[PDB]
Coordinates of N, CA, C and O in Angstrom, one line a residue:
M1 N -5.4 -15.4 -5.0 CA -4.8 -14.2 -4.3 C -5.4 -12.9 -5.0 O -5.6 -13.1 -6.3
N2 N -5.7 -11.9 -4.2 CA -5.9 -10.5 -5.0 C -5.5 -9.5 -4.1 O -5.0 -9.6 -3.1
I3 N -5.6 -8.4 -4.6 CA -5.3 -7.1 -3.9 C -5.7 -7.0 -2.6 O -4.9 -6.5 -1.7
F4 N -6.8 -7.4 -2.2 CA -7.3 -7.1 -0.9 C -6.6 -8.2 0.1 O -6.3 -7.9 1.2
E5 N -6.5 -9.3 -0.5 CA -5.8 -10.4 0.4 C -4.3 -9.9 0.5 O -3.7 -10.1 1.5
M6 N -3.9 -9.5 -0.4 CA -2.4 -9.3 -0.6 C -2.1 -8.1 0.6 O -1.2 -8.1 1.4
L7 N -2.9 -6.9 0.5 CA -2.7 -6.0 1.3 C -3.0 -6.5 2.8 O -2.5 -5.8 3.9
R8 N -4.1 -7.3 3.1 CA -4.3 -7.6 4.3 C -3.1 -8.4 5.0 O -2.9 -8.3 6.1
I9 N -2.4 -9.0 4.0 CA -1.2 -9.7 4.5 C -0.2 -8.6 5.0 O 0.4 -8.8 6.0
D10 N 0.0 -7.6 4.1 CA 1.0 -6.7 4.4 C 0.8 -5.6 5.5 O 1.6 -5.2 6.2
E11 N -0.4 -5.3 5.7 CA -0.7 -4.4 6.8 C -1.4 -5.0 8.1 O -1.3 -4.3 9.1
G12 N -1.8 -6.1 8.0 CA -2.4 -6.7 9.1 C -3.8 -6.0 9.4 O -4.3 -5.3 8.6
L13 N -4.4 -6.4 10.6 CA -5.6 -5.9 11.1 C -5.6 -5.5 12.5 O -5.3 -6.5 13.3
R14 N -5.9 -4.4 12.9 CA -5.8 -3.8 14.3 C -7.1 -2.9 14.5 O -7.4 -2.0 13.7
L15 N -7.9 -3.4 15.4 CA -9.1 -2.8 15.9 C -9.0 -1.6 16.8 O -9.9 -0.8 17.2
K16 N -7.7 -1.3 17.5 CA -7.5 -0.2 18.3 C -6.5 0.7 17.6 O -5.6 0.2 16.9
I17 N -6.5 2.0 17.9 CA -5.5 2.9 17.3 C -4.1 2.2 17.5 O -3.8 1.8 18.7
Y18 N -3.1 2.4 16.6 CA -1.7 1.9 16.9 C -0.7 2.8 16.0 O -1.3 3.6 15.3
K19 N 0.4 2.7 16.2 CA 1.4 3.3 15.5 C 2.1 2.5 14.5 O 2.3 1.5 14.5
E20 N 2.2 3.2 13.2 CA 2.8 2.1 12.2 C 4.3 2.4 12.4 O 5.0 2.9 13.1
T21 N 4.9 1.9 11.3 CA 6.4 1.8 11.4 C 7.1 3.1 11.6 O 8.1 3.2 12.2
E22 N 6.7 4.2 10.9 CA 7.1 5.6 11.1 C 6.7 6.2 12.3 O 7.0 7.5 12.5
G23 N 6.0 5.6 13.2 CA 5.3 6.1 14.5 C 4.0 7.0 14.2 O 3.6 7.7 15.1
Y24 N 3.3 6.6 13.2 CA 2.0 7.6 13.1 C 0.9 6.7 13.2 O 0.8 5.5 13.1
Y25 N -0.2 7.4 13.8 CA -1.3 6.7 14.2 C -2.1 6.3 13.0 O -2.3 6.9 12.1
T26 N -2.4 5.0 13.2 CA -3.2 4.2 12.2 C -4.2 3.5 13.0 O -4.2 3.0 14.2
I27 N -5.1 2.7 12.2 CA -6.0 1.8 12.7 C -6.5 0.9 11.6 O -6.3 1.2 10.3
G28 N -7.1 -0.3 11.8 CA -7.7 -1.1 10.8 C -6.6 -1.9 10.0 O -5.6 -2.4 10.7
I29 N -6.8 -1.7 8.7 CA -6.0 -2.5 7.7 C -5.1 -1.3 7.2 O -5.3 -0.8 6.1
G30 N -4.1 -1.0 7.8 CA -3.3 0.1 7.5 C -3.9 1.5 7.2 O -3.4 2.3 6.3
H31 N -5.0 1.9 7.9 CA -5.6 3.2 7.4 C -4.9 4.2 8.4 O -5.3 4.3 9.6
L32 N -4.2 5.1 7.7 CA -3.5 6.1 8.3 C -4.4 7.2 8.8 O -5.3 7.8 8.3
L33 N -4.4 7.6 10.1 CA -5.2 8.6 10.7 C -4.6 9.9 10.6 O -5.3 10.9 10.0
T34 N -3.4 10.0 10.8 CA -2.9 11.4 10.9 C -1.4 11.3 11.2 O -0.9 10.2 11.9
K35 N -0.8 12.2 10.7 CA 0.8 12.4 10.8 C 1.1 13.0 12.3 O 2.2 13.1 12.5
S36 N 0.1 13.5 12.8 CA 0.2 14.3 14.1 C 0.5 13.4 15.3 O 0.1 12.3 15.5
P37 N 1.3 14.1 16.3 CA 1.8 13.3 17.2 C 0.7 13.2 18.5 O 0.6 12.3 19.2
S38 N -0.4 14.2 18.0 CA -1.5 13.9 19.2 C -2.4 12.8 19.0 O -3.0 12.7 17.9
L39 N -2.6 12.1 20.1 CA -3.4 10.8 20.1 C -4.9 11.4 20.2 O -5.9 10.8 19.6
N40 N -5.1 12.6 20.6 CA -6.3 13.2 20.5 C -6.6 13.5 19.1 O -7.8 13.2 18.6
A41 N -5.8 14.2 18.6 CA -6.0 14.5 17.1 C -6.2 13.2 16.3 O -7.1 13.2 15.4
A42 N -5.7 12.0 16.7 CA -5.9 10.8 16.1 C -7.3 10.4 16.3 O -8.0 9.9 15.4
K43 N -7.8 10.5 17.5 CA -9.0 10.0 17.9 C -10.2 10.9 17.2 O -11.3 10.3 16.8
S44 N -9.9 12.1 16.9 CA -10.8 13.0 16.3 C -11.0 12.5 14.8 O -12.0 12.4 14.2
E45 N -9.8 12.3 14.2 CA -9.7 11.9 12.7 C -10.5 10.5 12.8 O -11.4 10.3 11.8
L46 N -10.3 9.7 13.7 CA -11.0 8.5 13.6 C -12.5 8.6 13.7 O -13.3 8.0 12.9
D47 N -13.1 9.4 14.7 CA -14.4 9.6 14.8 C -15.1 10.0 13.6 O -16.3 9.5 13.1
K48 N -14.5 11.1 12.9 CA -14.8 11.7 11.8 C -14.8 10.7 10.6 O -15.9 10.6 9.9
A49 N -13.9 9.9 10.5 CA -13.9 8.8 9.6 C -15.0 7.8 9.6 O -15.6 7.4 8.7
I50 N -15.4 7.4 11.0 CA -16.3 6.5 11.2 C -17.6 7.0 11.4 O -18.6 6.4 11.0
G51 N -17.6 8.2 11.9 CA -18.9 8.9 11.9 C -19.6 8.5 13.2 O -20.7 8.5 13.3
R52 N -18.8 8.3 14.2 CA -19.2 8.0 15.5 C -18.1 8.2 16.6 O -17.0 8.5 16.1
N53 N -18.6 8.3 17.8 CA -17.7 8.6 18.9 C -17.0 7.3 19.1 O -17.8 6.3 19.8
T54 N -16.0 7.1 18.6 CA -15.2 5.6 18.9 C -14.6 5.3 20.1 O -14.4 4.1 20.3
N55 N -14.0 6.4 20.7 CA -13.1 6.1 21.8 C -11.8 5.3 21.3 O -11.2 4.5 22.0
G56 N -11.4 5.4 20.0 CA -10.2 4.7 19.5 C -10.4 3.2 19.2 O -9.5 2.6 18.9
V57 N -11.5 2.6 19.2 CA -11.7 1.5 18.9 C -12.9 1.2 17.9 O -13.8 2.0 17.9
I58 N -12.6 0.3 16.8 CA -13.7 0.0 15.7 C -13.9 -1.4 15.6 O -13.2 -2.2 16.2
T59 N -15.0 -1.7 15.0 CA -15.2 -2.9 14.9 C -14.7 -3.5 13.5 O -14.1 -2.7 12.7
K60 N -14.7 -4.8 13.4 CA -14.1 -5.4 12.1 C -14.7 -5.0 10.9 O -14.1 -4.6 9.9
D61 N -16.2 -4.8 10.9 CA -16.8 -4.3 9.8 C -16.4 -2.9 9.5 O -16.2 -2.7 8.3
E62 N -16.1 -1.9 10.3 CA -15.7 -0.6 10.3 C -14.5 -0.7 9.5 O -14.1 0.0 8.7
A63 N -13.4 -1.4 10.1 CA -12.3 -1.4 9.5 C -12.1 -1.9 8.0 O -11.5 -1.4 7.1
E64 N -13.1 -2.9 7.6 CA -13.2 -3.5 6.1 C -13.7 -2.4 5.4 O -13.4 -2.2 4.3
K65 N -14.6 -1.6 6.1 CA -15.2 -0.6 5.3 C -14.2 0.4 4.9 O -14.0 1.0 3.8
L66 N -13.2 0.9 5.9 CA -12.1 1.9 5.6 C -11.2 1.3 4.6 O -10.8 2.0 3.6
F67 N -11.1 0.0 4.6 CA -10.2 -0.6 3.7 C -10.8 -0.7 2.3 O -10.1 -0.3 1.3
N68 N -12.0 -1.0 2.1 CA -12.6 -0.8 0.8 C -12.5 0.5 0.1 O -12.1 0.6 -0.9
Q69 N -12.6 1.5 1.0 CA -12.5 2.9 0.6 C -11.1 3.2 0.1 O -10.9 4.0 -0.8
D70 N -10.2 2.7 1.0 CA -8.7 3.0 0.8 C -8.3 2.5 -0.5 O -7.4 2.9 -1.3
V71 N -8.7 1.1 -0.8 CA -8.3 0.4 -2.0 C -8.8 1.1 -3.2 O -8.1 1.5 -4.3
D72 N -10.1 1.5 -3.1 CA -10.8 2.1 -4.0 C -10.1 3.4 -4.6 O -9.9 3.7 -5.6
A73 N -9.7 4.1 -3.3 CA -9.0 5.5 -3.4 C -7.6 5.4 -4.2 O -7.2 6.2 -5.0
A74 N -6.9 4.3 -3.7 CA -5.5 3.9 -4.4 C -5.7 3.7 -6.0 O -4.9 4.5 -6.7
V75 N -6.7 3.0 -6.4 CA -6.8 2.6 -7.8 C -7.0 3.8 -8.6 O -6.5 4.4 -9.7
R76 N -8.1 4.7 -7.9 CA -8.5 6.0 -8.4 C -7.4 6.9 -8.5 O -7.2 7.7 -9.5
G77 N -6.5 7.1 -7.5 CA -5.3 7.9 -7.5 C -4.5 7.7 -8.6 O -3.9 8.5 -9.3
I78 N -4.1 6.4 -9.0 CA -3.2 5.8 -10.0 C -3.8 6.1 -11.3 O -3.3 6.8 -12.2
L79 N -5.1 6.0 -11.5 CA -5.9 6.3 -12.7 C -5.8 7.7 -13.1 O -5.8 8.1 -14.2
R80 N -5.8 8.6 -12.1 CA -5.7 10.0 -12.3 C -4.4 10.7 -12.4 O -4.3 11.8 -12.9
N81 N -3.3 9.7 -12.0 CA -2.1 10.3 -12.2 C -1.3 10.0 -13.6 O -1.5 8.9 -14.1
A82 N -1.0 11.2 -14.0 CA -0.4 11.2 -15.3 C 0.9 10.3 -15.5 O 1.1 9.6 -16.5
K83 N 1.7 10.1 -14.4 CA 2.9 9.4 -14.3 C 2.5 7.9 -14.2 O 3.1 7.0 -14.7
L84 N 1.4 7.7 -13.4 CA 1.0 6.3 -13.0 C 0.3 5.5 -13.9 O 0.5 4.3 -14.3
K85 N -0.8 6.3 -14.4 CA -1.6 5.6 -15.2 C -1.0 4.7 -16.5 O -1.3 3.7 -16.8
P86 N -0.1 5.3 -17.2 CA 0.4 4.7 -18.4 C 1.2 3.4 -17.7 O 1.2 2.3 -18.5
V87 N 1.7 3.5 -16.6 CA 2.6 2.3 -16.2 C 1.4 1.1 -15.8 O 1.5 0.1 -16.3
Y88 N 0.5 1.6 -15.3 CA -0.6 0.8 -14.7 C -1.2 0.1 -16.0 O -1.3 -1.1 -16.0
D89 N -1.5 1.0 -16.9 CA -2.1 0.3 -18.2 C -1.4 -0.6 -18.9 O -1.9 -1.5 -19.6
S90 N 0.1 -0.4 -18.9 CA 0.9 -1.4 -19.5 C 1.1 -2.7 -18.7 O 1.7 -3.7 -19.2
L91 N 0.6 -2.8 -17.6 CA 0.9 -4.1 -16.8 C -0.1 -5.0 -17.0 O -1.2 -4.8 -17.3
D92 N 0.2 -6.2 -16.4 CA -0.5 -7.5 -16.3 C -1.3 -7.4 -14.9 O -0.9 -6.4 -14.1
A93 N -2.3 -8.3 -14.9 CA -3.0 -8.1 -13.6 C -2.3 -8.3 -12.3 O -2.5 -7.5 -11.1
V94 N -1.3 -9.2 -12.1 CA -0.6 -9.3 -11.0 C 0.3 -8.2 -10.8 O 0.2 -7.6 -9.5
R95 N 0.9 -7.8 -11.6 CA 1.7 -6.6 -11.4 C 0.9 -5.3 -11.1 O 1.5 -4.6 -10.3
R96 N -0.2 -5.2 -11.7 CA -1.0 -4.1 -11.3 C -1.3 -4.0 -9.9 O -1.2 -2.9 -9.1
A97 N -1.6 -5.2 -9.3 CA -1.7 -5.4 -7.9 C -0.5 -4.8 -7.1 O -0.6 -4.2 -6.0
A98 N 0.8 -5.2 -7.6 CA 1.9 -4.7 -6.9 C 2.1 -3.1 -6.9 O 2.4 -2.5 -6.0
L99 N 1.7 -2.6 -7.9 CA 1.8 -1.0 -8.0 C 0.7 -0.5 -7.1 O 0.9 0.5 -6.4
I100 N -0.5 -1.0 -6.9 CA -1.6 -0.6 -6.2 C -0.9 -0.7 -4.7 O -1.3 0.3 -3.9
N101 N -0.3 -1.7 -4.3 CA 0.2 -1.8 -3.0 C 1.1 -0.8 -2.5 O 1.1 -0.2 -1.5
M102 N 2.0 -0.5 -3.5 CA 2.8 0.5 -3.3 C 2.2 1.8 -3.0 O 2.5 2.8 -2.1
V103 N 1.1 2.2 -3.8 CA 0.4 3.5 -3.7 C -0.3 3.5 -2.4 O -0.4 4.5 -1.8
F104 N -0.9 2.5 -2.0 CA -1.5 2.2 -0.8 C -0.6 2.7 0.4 O -0.9 3.4 1.3
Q105 N 0.6 2.0 0.3 CA 1.5 2.3 1.3 C 2.1 3.7 1.4 O 2.3 4.3 2.4
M106 N 2.5 4.3 0.3 CA 3.1 5.6 0.3 C 2.7 6.7 -0.4 O 3.2 7.8 -0.4
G107 N 1.4 6.4 -1.1 CA 0.7 7.5 -1.7 C 1.5 7.7 -3.2 O 2.3 7.1 -3.5
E108 N 0.6 8.2 -3.9 CA 0.6 8.6 -5.1 C 1.9 9.2 -5.7 O 2.5 9.0 -6.6
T109 N 1.9 10.3 -4.7 CA 2.9 11.2 -5.0 C 4.4 10.5 -4.6 O 5.2 10.6 -5.5
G110 N 4.3 9.7 -3.5 CA 5.5 9.1 -3.4 C 6.0 8.0 -4.4 O 7.2 8.0 -4.9
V111 N 5.0 7.3 -5.0 CA 5.3 6.4 -6.1 C 5.6 7.0 -7.4 O 6.5 6.5 -8.0
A112 N 5.1 8.1 -7.7 CA 5.3 8.9 -9.0 C 6.8 9.2 -9.0 O 7.4 9.6 -10.0
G113 N 7.3 9.4 -7.7 CA 8.9 10.0 -7.5 C 10.0 8.6 -8.2 O 10.9 9.0 -8.1
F114 N 9.4 7.5 -8.4 CA 10.1 6.3 -8.8 C 10.3 6.4 -10.1 O 10.2 5.3 -10.8
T115 N 10.7 7.4 -10.8 CA 10.8 7.6 -12.1 C 11.4 6.5 -12.9 O 10.8 6.0 -14.0
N116 N 12.7 6.1 -12.6 CA 13.3 5.2 -13.2 C 12.7 3.8 -13.2 O 12.8 3.2 -14.1
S117 N 12.3 3.6 -11.9 CA 11.9 2.2 -11.9 C 10.5 2.1 -12.9 O 10.3 1.1 -13.3
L118 N 9.6 3.1 -12.8 CA 8.4 3.1 -13.4 C 8.7 3.0 -14.9 O 8.0 2.3 -15.5
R119 N 9.8 3.7 -15.4 CA 10.2 3.5 -16.9 C 10.6 2.1 -17.1 O 10.1 1.6 -18.2
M120 N 11.3 1.5 -16.2 CA 11.8 0.1 -16.3 C 10.6 -0.9 -16.5 O 10.4 -1.9 -17.2
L121 N 9.6 -0.6 -15.5 CA 8.5 -1.5 -15.4 C 7.7 -1.4 -16.9 O 7.3 -2.3 -17.3
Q122 N 7.5 -0.1 -17.3 CA 6.9 0.1 -18.4 C 7.4 -0.6 -19.7 O 7.0 -1.2 -20.5
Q123 N 8.8 -0.7 -19.6 CA 9.4 -1.3 -20.6 C 9.5 -2.9 -20.4 O 10.2 -3.5 -21.3
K124 N 9.0 -3.2 -19.3 CA 8.9 -4.8 -18.9 C 10.5 -5.3 -18.7 O 10.8 -6.5 -19.1
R125 N 11.4 -4.4 -18.1 CA 12.6 -4.8 -17.8 C 12.5 -5.1 -16.3 O 13.1 -4.4 -15.4
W126 N 12.0 -6.3 -15.9 CA 11.7 -6.8 -14.6 C 13.0 -6.9 -13.7 O 12.8 -6.4 -12.6
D127 N 14.0 -7.5 -14.1 CA 15.2 -7.6 -13.2 C 15.7 -6.4 -13.0 O 16.1 -6.0 -11.8
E128 N 15.7 -5.5 -14.0 CA 16.5 -4.1 -13.6 C 15.4 -3.3 -12.9 O 16.0 -2.5 -12.2
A129 N 14.2 -3.5 -13.1 CA 13.3 -2.7 -12.2 C 13.3 -3.0 -10.7 O 13.4 -2.3 -9.8
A130 N 13.5 -4.4 -10.5 CA 13.7 -4.9 -9.2 C 15.0 -4.5 -8.5 O 15.0 -4.0 -7.4
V131 N 15.9 -4.4 -9.2 CA 17.2 -4.0 -8.6 C 17.1 -2.3 -8.3 O 17.5 -1.8 -7.2
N132 N 16.4 -1.6 -9.2 CA 16.3 0.0 -9.1 C 15.4 0.2 -7.8 O 15.5 1.0 -7.0
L133 N 14.3 -0.7 -7.7 CA 13.3 -0.4 -6.6 C 13.9 -0.6 -5.2 O 13.6 0.0 -4.3
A134 N 14.9 -1.4 -5.2 CA 15.6 -1.8 -3.9 C 16.5 -0.8 -3.3 O 16.8 -0.7 -2.2
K135 N 16.9 0.3 -4.4 CA 17.7 1.3 -3.9 C 16.8 2.5 -3.5 O 16.7 3.6 -4.1
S136 N 16.2 2.1 -2.2 CA 15.2 3.2 -1.7 C 15.1 3.2 -0.3 O 15.4 2.1 0.3
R137 N 14.8 4.3 0.1 CA 14.6 4.3 1.6 C 13.5 3.3 1.9 O 13.5 2.5 2.9
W138 N 12.4 3.2 1.0 CA 11.2 2.3 1.1 C 11.8 0.8 1.4 O 11.4 0.1 2.6
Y139 N 12.6 0.3 0.7 CA 13.4 -1.0 0.9 C 14.1 -1.2 2.1 O 14.0 -2.2 3.0
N140 N 15.0 -0.1 2.5 CA 15.6 -0.1 3.7 C 14.8 0.0 4.9 O 15.2 -0.6 6.0
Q141 N 13.6 0.6 5.0 CA 12.9 0.9 6.0 C 11.8 -0.4 6.2 O 11.6 -0.8 7.4
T142 N 11.3 -1.0 5.2 CA 10.3 -2.1 5.3 C 10.8 -3.1 4.2 O 10.2 -3.3 3.3
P143 N 12.0 -3.7 4.5 CA 12.5 -4.6 3.6 C 11.7 -5.9 3.4 O 11.6 -6.4 2.2
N144 N 11.2 -6.6 4.4 CA 10.4 -7.7 4.2 C 9.2 -7.4 3.2 O 8.8 -8.2 2.2
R145 N 8.5 -6.3 3.6 CA 7.4 -6.1 2.6 C 7.8 -5.6 1.3 O 7.2 -6.2 0.3
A146 N 8.8 -4.8 1.3 CA 9.5 -4.3 0.0 C 9.7 -5.4 -0.7 O 9.6 -5.6 -2.1
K147 N 10.4 -6.5 -0.3 CA 10.9 -7.7 -0.9 C 9.6 -8.4 -1.6 O 9.8 -9.0 -2.6
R148 N 8.5 -8.5 -0.8 CA 7.3 -9.2 -1.4 C 7.0 -8.4 -2.7 O 6.6 -9.0 -3.6
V149 N 6.9 -7.3 -2.6 CA 6.3 -6.4 -3.5 C 7.2 -6.5 -4.9 O 6.7 -6.6 -6.1
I150 N 8.6 -6.2 -4.7 CA 9.4 -6.4 -5.6 C 9.5 -7.7 -6.4 O 9.6 -7.7 -7.5
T151 N 9.4 -8.8 -5.7 CA 9.3 -10.1 -6.2 C 8.2 -10.4 -7.1 O 8.1 -11.0 -8.1
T152 N 6.9 -9.7 -6.7 CA 5.8 -9.8 -7.5 C 6.0 -8.9 -8.8 O 5.6 -9.5 -9.8
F153 N 6.8 -7.8 -8.6 CA 6.9 -7.1 -9.9 C 7.9 -8.0 -10.9 O 7.9 -7.9 -12.0
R154 N 8.8 -8.6 -10.2 CA 9.9 -9.3 -10.9 C 9.2 -10.4 -11.7 O 9.7 -10.5 -12.7
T155 N 8.4 -11.3 -10.9 CA 7.9 -12.6 -11.6 C 6.5 -12.5 -12.2 O 6.3 -13.3 -12.8
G156 N 5.8 -11.5 -11.9 CA 4.5 -11.5 -12.3 C 3.6 -12.8 -11.5 O 2.5 -13.0 -12.1
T157 N 4.1 -13.4 -10.4 CA 3.1 -14.4 -9.8 C 3.0 -13.9 -8.4 O 3.6 -12.9 -7.9
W158 N 2.2 -14.7 -7.7 CA 2.0 -14.3 -6.3 C 3.0 -15.2 -5.3 O 2.5 -15.4 -4.2
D159 N 4.0 -15.7 -5.9 CA 4.7 -16.7 -5.1 C 5.2 -16.2 -3.8 O 5.3 -16.9 -2.7
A160 N 5.4 -14.8 -3.6 CA 6.0 -14.3 -2.5 C 4.9 -14.2 -1.3 O 5.3 -14.0 -0.2
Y161 N 3.6 -14.4 -1.7 CA 2.6 -14.3 -0.7 C 2.1 -15.7 -0.5 O 1.2 -15.9 0.4
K162 N 2.5 -16.8 -1.2 CA 1.8 -18.2 -1.0 C 2.7 -18.6 0.3 O 3.8 -18.5 0.4
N163 N 1.8 -19.1 1.2 CA 2.2 -19.5 2.5 C 1.6 -18.6 3.7 O 1.2 -19.1 4.7
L164 N 1.9 -17.4 3.6 CA 1.3 -16.1 4.5 C -0.1 -15.9 5.0 O -0.4 -15.2 6.0

């Protein structure tokens, strides 16, 4: 298991524009296109991202390309983040992947807001971090996903994802 497989599990893969859980237009492996309600605006962003007139449809290769860029962007955001980096640096490989998943999902900014949990993780207080992380809108809005990430932080293993 690795970050790509992990996220592929959490996000799925969709070749036509769709709305994700909060109702925003997305495509591929969780590639947010726009927060705007306009489908046109979404199609514009998509063409721009792809570099062609897509008509709202991409191929599998294009989706994987956006995915590689997004993963890359997520790691980079972490490393550049003053609150994030130190945590990331103190963690083991499995757990690093869990933090990358949250950032891919909610952005750097949103993740850096988890002050107390970040602190707990830094101190390797697994059980406590897990309970703190659950006290969030994130957990209440996408509980199955949240549970898989939280368990990964808790255990430091990929068990939450074995079977999927």
